[PDB]
Design a protein around this nucleic acid. Structure first.
Length: 182
RNA sequence: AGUUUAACUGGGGCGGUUGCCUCCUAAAAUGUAACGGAGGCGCCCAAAGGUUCCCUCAACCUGGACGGCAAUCAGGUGUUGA
């Protein structure tokens, strides 16, 4: 029909490749990309919550979704933080938007960041769910670079049905993630 | 000039206290004294009430850019210690 590039590639070849690398007794034990979450934790919004709107605009122009403004769970004296205030913009991404954002990320943004010597393959939680982070936003072409007054990084996590870092790493590298060899 | 100027009080005075709520004392019903042991109240909320629906934390582990023990994100453990 009109499936995303990455998704048709996934269910055409990557599933079989993962089966070969890990002979799974059941097809439903195959790893799959559940979701990707883009956090934009901005703790600098406590003193002034005017940076959160820029975080929102950035995440929207990146992913395609209005983010969820994560109110603080707790007040912290050191971080100048009360409860309930806007610290962080989260976007959950599932399905077609997820696959499209991953293709965009891989094929555009990661080679667009300065001095891209790869992403660490050790950055797995222990359940085949990856998480890396960025220090800025201009790596996404969707943003007008002239309109970037403040750098605003993020934490991108890719959570999968994999049950270990090995299968997760296989899946991500098959999708085409830049895992440097260390 | 007429009068008032409290009481409890291990004598009285000084000090402290005086009403309400919670615990212990209190002896497994209730209740139970002491200038016995500890605290709190003299409000707040127009939602912090009503109802319908939904959810389940804290803590810990692991991974994560600033981010640090601890901000927000992900996964897991977690039947309750929040």
């Amino acid at each position: 029909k009109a499936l995303p590039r990455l998704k048709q590639r996934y269910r055409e070849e990557i599933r079989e490749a993962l089966q070969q690398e890990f002979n799974y007794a059941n097809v439903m034990q195959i790893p799959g990309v559940v979701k990707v979450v883009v956090n934009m934790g901005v703790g600098d919004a406590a003193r002034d919550a005017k940076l959160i709107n820029g975080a929102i605009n950035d995440l929207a122009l990146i992913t395609g979704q209005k983010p969820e403004v994560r109110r603080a769970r707790k007040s912290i004296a050191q971080f100048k933080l009360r409860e309930g205030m806007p610290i962080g913009a989260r976007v959950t991404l599932r399905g077609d938007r997820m696959w499209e954002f991953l293709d965009r990320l891989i094929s555009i943004a990661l080679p667009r960041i300065r001095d891209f010597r790869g992403l660490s393959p050790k950055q797995f939680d222990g359940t085949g769910n990856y998480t890396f982070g960025l220090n800025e936003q201009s790596m996404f072409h969707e943003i007008d670079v002239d309109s970037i007054d403040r750098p605003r990084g993020m934490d991108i996590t890719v959570v999968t049905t994999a049950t270990n870092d090995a299968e997760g790493r296989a899946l991500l590298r098959a999708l085409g993630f830049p895992f440097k060899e260390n």
